[PDB]
Structure formats: C-alpha cells, structure tokens
Amino acid sequence: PKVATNIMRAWLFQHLTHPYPSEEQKKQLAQDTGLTILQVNNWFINARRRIVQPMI
Amino acid sequence: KPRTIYSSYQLAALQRRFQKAQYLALPERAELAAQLGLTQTQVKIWFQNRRSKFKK
DNA sequence: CAATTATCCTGTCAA
DNA sequence: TTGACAGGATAATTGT
C-alpha cells in the first residue's frame, strides 16, 4: 500500500473541504495509483475522521 | 446527483416544518434557503424524501 | 405521486 | 498503534 497515499494526501489540500470527487475523476486518482475503484472511495471515507474531526 | 451533503443545521428547521407543513411553493424559498445558501431543487425533493418512511 | 438506481455515512471486527 | 465487509439510512436519478 505504501506511497499509494501521500499522492492522495498531498493533493488533498485541493478537495479538503469537499470530498465530492467526480465519478470519473475517481479514475484519474484511481488508475494513477489504481486498484479496485470500490476500495478507493472507501479509503477517502475512512479518513475524514482520522484527524480534522478532533482538530475542531 | 451527487448526494449533496446539505447538511450542517440547515436540517431540522425542517423536521418540525414537516410537522407544521407538508406543503410549500416558491415564495418562501428565499429566506427559507438564500440566508442558508442552497439551491431550489435541492429540497423540492425533501418532503418527497420523507413522505416515507412508513406514512401508511 | 411511486418506483428506482446511485450514494456515502456510520455502525458491526481484523494483519 | 489502520483497512475490508455486511448491515441500516439517505439523496439523487428517472419515465408507464
């Protein structure tokens, strides 16, 4: 899994506010890192709470 | 589409409004939402979202 | 207006 | 000390 992430996080300053990525924009963030498209929505919706949530 | 989080609060100003009124037209929609920011068709649905559960 | 198809959000435990 | 699936809740789609 390593460094299939900081790519995701380094851009994440872009849609920090709005994890409402386009359905085919999941692809250009998927395939470039790839793996099952279903697994990728999940990783971005198992991290809204890891931080920022306590940061309030 | 997509799901569109409304979704702060926002909300349960409605949940009694449904208890008050299962009907409205255009004219309220300004202060009803323009002071709240969201679009028209975002919520013309939302009663229709809640004419169930149940509502036998 | 009922029926659909697309969503995430949580809520069940795991190398 | 982080990542997978079923569950139960929800907002759009859409056309007899």
**Domain range enclosing A11:** 1-56
Give yes or no for a contact between A26 and A40, defined as CB atoms under 8 angstroms apart. yes
What is the DSSP code (8-state) at residue B55? -
Instruction: Measure the CA–CA gap between B56 and B15, rounded to whole angstroms.
Output: 18
Chain C: bases < 7 Å from a protein Cβ: 1-2, 6-10
DSSP string, A2-55: TTSSHHHHHSTTSSSS-----TTHHHHHHTTT-S-HHHHHHHTTSSTTTTTTTT
Q: Judge if the beta carbon of A43 is closer than 7 A to nucleic acid strand D.
A: yes
Q: What is the CATH number of the domain that holds B1?
A: 1.10.10.60
Taking only residues 1 to 56 of chain B, the set having a beta carbon closer than 8 angstroms to any beta carbon of chain A reads 2, 4-5
**Domain range enclosing B8:** 1-56
Give yes or no for a contact between B19 and B48, defined as CB atoms under 8 angstroms apart. no
Q: What is the CATH number of the domain that holds A7?
A: 1.10.10.60
> Chain A residue with minimal CA distance to B4?
A20
Resolution in A: 3.5
Based on the structure, what is the number of domains in chain B? 1
Give yes or no for a contact between B2 and A20, defined as CB atoms under 8 angstroms apart. yes
Q: Please give the method by which this entry was determined.
A: X-ray
Q: Which residue has the tokens 């709240």?
A: B36
Give yes or no for a contact between B47 and B18, defined as CB atoms under 8 angstroms apart. yes
**Cβ within 8 Å of residue B6, ≥6 positions away:** B38, B42, B43
Q: How many CB atoms lie within 10 A of CB A40?
A: 20
Based on the structure, what is the number of domains in chain A? 1
